[PDB]
Design a protein around this nucleic acid. Structure first.
Lengths: 135, 164, 48, 120, 238, 81, 83
RNA sequence: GGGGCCUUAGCUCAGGGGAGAGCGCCUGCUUUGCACGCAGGAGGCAGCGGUUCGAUCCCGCUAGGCUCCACCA
RNA sequence: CUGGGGCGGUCGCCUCCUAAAAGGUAACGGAGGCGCCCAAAGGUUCCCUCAGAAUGGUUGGAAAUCAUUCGCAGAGUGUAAAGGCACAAGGGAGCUUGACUGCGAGACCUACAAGUCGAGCAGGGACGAAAGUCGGGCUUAGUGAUCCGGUGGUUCCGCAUGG
RNA sequence: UGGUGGCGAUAGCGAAGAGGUCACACCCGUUCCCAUACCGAACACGGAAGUUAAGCUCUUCAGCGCCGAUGGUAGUCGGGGGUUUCCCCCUGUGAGAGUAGGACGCCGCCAA
């Protein structure tokens, strides 16, 4: 459950996930990676689920290199409450994702193993994905 | 007026011949001397300033300047201001006279004097020194030179006869 | 304390000016020089 | 190791600090000064056009003397440049102590020009 | 010292440590005794009490006097300062209010008073007054004499009708014929004017009772503390 | 139903209508202001003056022109006919 | 302040409880008047007290609450004792 | 859940310039003496963050506790 | 006011974001500040340039003060933030009180009330040799109507006339 | 050469070299003007024995910094469409970044 240690503002606007990514569109730390085909917010619980999934499938395998970090916080008012009276309290932390963006990489491991692990992770994630490799 | 003429006549032709400088303007000399007292005890005893500032005066005829704080440190119970330490710059002839006086008296009169610290240079061509005796407070003095490297300063002071 | 003050002339007797001051740092009856538009001159003014 | 700044560069900074407040025009030009260790030079300028109008120096072959560097020389060159700016009948100027003091040779020169007729 | 178990008086080559803080009692002594003059010493009639008759000039150079009293009773020792003629207390180390419904009182201003001196002949008379059939008479020599320890009483009673021992030892003390030593009966280091009389303990003798006190208390000030710590830890470990 | 509150972030200052007030190539009268600001986003130039509020005004009549002090620094000026 | 608090801080009595107990017994008084633990006091007060037969008369000089040990007795003065 | 008060040694307390006053329980010592003591259990700002040279002392966020409120259909 | 009301919270001013590249723009939207301070922390003249780092060096210590090279700026700018400033608006020294009087072309903002800037003229001055700057402070907050009373001054009026 | 101004560092940083009889500097001493919170370092005052080392000028370079295209792409006014937390099509516009490359200076006035 990743966390930014320190932040300026505990409360931010949400934002808009228009367009494609700026960077991180291609694997370069590792060999076999995964990228997105949509745009969405992703949570520390999602990423750690995917991470531990692939690492359990691999059991010693090489290196991973996540390519993101949930910097963004997201609020949520308490339950059964009218509107207004200030912005809701923070709940967790979020990473924002554009399409064309690489999320997880892999090295030290064969292609079939990598593809299967990333499949497993994709099923923990909400969005549509693609298997990718380095050029 | 001893060490000026000694410097010129003995050192500079000899030293230029020794180092193969291009011109006499490349000669190393002392640009100045500086001395500091460095006493943060006045916070306790405000009278600790004129105490030994008078002594700096009786040492060097030039009046000193009380140094002051530039920041605040609760670790030493200090804020900006509160004059601590005292300084004297020195650039000219009583400079050399004072240095003659030092090498003649102050160095040997130390009750365990030996080969003084070979290495207390700054790696630039300028020397520093600390003293503890003279209340018996010492000081921190500095020699500043036109030497670019440091071995020429070494050779300079050796040829002066300042101990090592 | 920081407090209001008038600053009257001495030849004219007229008040002519106001300001403020610390009573701590400037306790005494302060004085400056200002222009008396009746005496038509720079002139020492005094606090009341 | 000790470096040493060029006092000329310092003088340039002080000169610029001055120059920020003024500039020489037609009918209010700038009178600039230079103070070599062996000479003293003076010029009069329309800073708008970037043009000198008149000039003077110890180096001038007229009135060659021994000092070229004391207040006497400063006075002589001041009166010279004054009559130059008289025969180019401007008579009204501004002064430019170029990062120097209005104390010594500069002061003497300026006083010379004041007496010769130039009005600051 | 009015320190209850270690309350005493002493002269020490070891000037231990003068404090950084002058306390109230110290400064009050400085007020009225500093630069003094010790005219006379007195024993308070052989009770564990002492008096210094002292002189000193007041704040106007007029000579004045005072009576410093040092009562060393044990757990309720104390140090008091008193006026000469008025007998009024001026200072006191352990102020003692009469909520203890006691005979005497400590507080300043009040007329000084001494403890109730018990009905004991301070110096054969025991064979007269006391019935030697009583047994355990090391207890009840305290009931006849003023200056007594159960140590002294036991060591004298073990000399076996023994008025001789009492009279001889009293003459010894009166003549200052004692021997200042420290005794050590398997630890439990004791000391007294007289030597050890019977027990198995080791003995180390001295030239000065003051040095005896020095070499005794200089350790016991902290040795016993370390022992307390050691035992408190040993309990936990066990 | 529940009960909540305490936003304590509910204010802001009155908007002060900064920026330029006259345009390049525009004719201007004496004393007209040109560019309200705080500090110097823009400096004065010829026949232009700065006030205590760091505001820029024309000392004369003329036409306005904005320029640059060499690099990364701007300027205004009034040039008459 | 209150009598019981005063007695504790002046260390005449070691427990405020005991002060209350004795005042409820009425063994003591103030200014010739029988008093209670809640009785108000002040400087200048003249206080009569009993300890069995030991009767006491004292005078109040000051009053506070932090009252370290030796500074307690500065708070007042003895005057007289009877029985 | 909201608001207010509080959260300093075992207990009770004071105190933007360096946390110190008193008291108690258990143990040990201790002794001639009318409960008159001593040492150790031990003496540590609820936490997090920030401003200041500095924070118990100013500010802010959160936790624990006490009190108040949590109403109309 | 109120995403029904009540209870809570807030009520005026300043700074930023939201704010959509002029300006302006709401919400019980997000973050913070003010109800002052300086008689020098102002004006003027002249002067010079910071924070931190590495070396050497008593007490000096990780950290005073010290010389030392590196060093557009990481510092400072009375205070919150934004804008801005190192040719100083930052830091020193000298002399002073323009933290003046009467005004004010013409502009900004604006429902009004009000608020803001302002060259330039006169009088008298301060600093400066001179040009020349000075009508408070680095700019933006630091404050409130009218009526009513009070104080001082006034070639105003003063119920027949003089007061 | 020196002085003095103008133009966005295409001017600078950095490395290597060359020159100084004139000139500019460095440099020699305080008796005076004046000064150094310390002092002739600096500022002032006077001087010219010697030094091109430094500064200053003239050459070189593209290591740093600086400038900077074309094309393409994102974005986007406008129009239109669609499975519309977004996406797509069309006329038009059009960056940044990354390149190509440029550049270790251009222009003036005075004095010898």
């Amino acid at each position: 459950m990743l966390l930014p240690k320190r932040v300026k503002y505990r409360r931010e606007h949400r934002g808009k996930m228009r367009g494609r990514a700026k960077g991180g569109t291609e694997v370069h730390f590792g060999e076999f990676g995964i990228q997105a085909l949509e745009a969405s917010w992703i949570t520390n619980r999602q990423i750690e689920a995917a991470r531990i999934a692939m690492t359990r499938y691999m059991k010693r395998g090489g290196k991973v290199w996540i390519k993101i970090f949930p910097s963004k916080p997201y609020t949520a008012k308490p339950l059964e409450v009218r509107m207004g009276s200030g912005k809701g309290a923070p709940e967790g932390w979020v990473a924002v994702v554009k399409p064309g963006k690489v999320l997880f990489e892999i090295s030290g491991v064969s292609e079939e193993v990598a593809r299967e692990a990333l499949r497993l992770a994709s099923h923990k994630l909400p969005i549509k994905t693609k298997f990718v490799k380095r050029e | 007026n001893r060490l000026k003429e000694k410097y010129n006549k003995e050192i500079a032709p000899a030293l230029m011949t020794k180092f193969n400088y291009d011109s006499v303007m490349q000669v190393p000399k002392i640009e100045k001397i500086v001395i500091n007292m460095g006493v943060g005890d006045a916070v306790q005893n405000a009278k600790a300033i004129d105490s030994a500032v008078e002594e700096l005066t009786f040492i060097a005829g030039q009046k000193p300047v009380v140094t002051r704080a530039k920041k605040s440190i609760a670790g030493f119970r200090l804020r900006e201001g509160m004059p601590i330490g005292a300084k004297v710059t020195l650039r000219g002839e009583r400079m050399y006279d004072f240095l003659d006086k030092l090498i003649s008296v102050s160095l040997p009169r130390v009750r365990d004097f030996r080969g003084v610290s070979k290495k207390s240079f700054d790696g630039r061509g300028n020397y520093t020194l600390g003293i503890k005796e003279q209340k018996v407070r010492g000081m921190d003095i500095v020699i500043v030179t036109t030497a670019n490297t440091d071995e020429e300063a070494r050779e300079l002071l050796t040829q002066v006869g300042m101990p090592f | 304390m920081r407090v209001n003050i008038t600053l009257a002339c001495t030849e004219c007797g007229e008040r002519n000016y106001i300001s403020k001051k610390n009573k701590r740092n400037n306790p005494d009856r302060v004085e400056f020089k200002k222009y008396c538009p009746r005496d038509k001159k720079s002139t020492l003014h005094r606090e009341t | 190791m000790i470096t040493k700044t060029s006092k000329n560069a310092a003088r340039l900074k002080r000169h610029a600090r001055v120059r920020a407040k003024l500039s020489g025009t037609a009918e209010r030009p700038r009178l600039n000064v230079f103070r070599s260790n062996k000479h003293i030079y003076a010029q009069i300028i329309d800073d708008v056009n970037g043009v000198t109008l008149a000039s003077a120096s110890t180096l001038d072959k007229d009135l060659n003397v021994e000092s070229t560097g004391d207040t006497s020389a400063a006075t002589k060159v001041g009166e010279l440049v004054a009559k130059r700016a008289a025969e180019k009948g401007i008579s009204d100027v501004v002064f430019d102590r170029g990062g120097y003091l209005y104390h010594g040779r500069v002061k003497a020169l300026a006083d010379a020009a004041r007496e010769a007729g130039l009005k600051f | 010292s009015a320190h209850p178990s270690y309350s005493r008086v002493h002269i020490t080559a070891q000037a231990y440590e003068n404090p950084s803080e002058p306390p109230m009692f110290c400064m009050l002594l400085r007020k009225h005794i500093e630069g003094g003059f010790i005219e006379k010493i007195e024993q308070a009639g052989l009770d564990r009490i002492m008096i210094f008759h002292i002189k000193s000039r007041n704040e106007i150079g007029d000579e004045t006097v005072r009576k410093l009293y040092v009562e060393i009773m044990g757990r309720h020792s104390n140090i008091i300062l008193t006026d000469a003629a008025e007998n009024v207390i001026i200072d006191g180390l352990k102020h003692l209010s009469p909520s203890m419904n006691s005979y005497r009182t400590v507080l300043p201003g009040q007329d000084y008073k001494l403890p109730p001196a018990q009905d004991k002949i301070s110096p054969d008379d025991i064979l007269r007054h006391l019935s030697f059939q009583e047994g355990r008479l090391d207890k009840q020599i305290v009931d006849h004499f003023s200056g007594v320890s159960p140590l002294f009483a036991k060591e004298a009673v073990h000399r076996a009708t023994l008025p001789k021992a009492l009279l001889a030892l009293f003459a010894e003390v009166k003549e200052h014929r004692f021997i200042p030593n420290i005794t050590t009966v398997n630890g439990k280091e004791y000391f007294y004017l007289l030597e050890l009389t019977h027990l198995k303990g080791e003995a180390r003798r001295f030239d000065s009772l003051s040095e005896l006190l020095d070499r005794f208390y200089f350790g016991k000030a902290e040795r016993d503390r370390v022992k307390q710590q050691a035992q408190d830890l040993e309990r936990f470990v066990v | 139903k529940k009960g909540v509150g305490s936003t304590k972030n509910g204010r802001d200052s009155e908007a002060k209508r900064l920026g330029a007030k006259r345009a390049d190539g525009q004719f201007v009268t004496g004393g007209s202001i040109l560019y309200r600001q705080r500090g110097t986003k823009i400096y004065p130039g010829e026949n232009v003056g700065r006030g205590g509020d760091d505001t820029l005004f024309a000392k004369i009549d003329g036409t306005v022109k904005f320029e640059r002090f060499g690099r990364d620094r701007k300027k205004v000026s009034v040039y008459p006919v | 302040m209150r009598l019981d608090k005063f007695l504790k801080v002046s260390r005449l009595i070691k427990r405020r409880t005991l002060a209350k107990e004795v005042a409820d017994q009425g063994r003591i008084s103030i200014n010739g008047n029988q008093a209670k633990a809640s009785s108000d006091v002040k400087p200048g007060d003249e206080l009569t007290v009993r300890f069995g037969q030991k009767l006491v008369t004292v005078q109040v000089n000051e009053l506070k609450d932090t009252t370290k040990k030796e500074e307690a007795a500065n708070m007042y003065t003895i005057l007289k004792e009877e029985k």
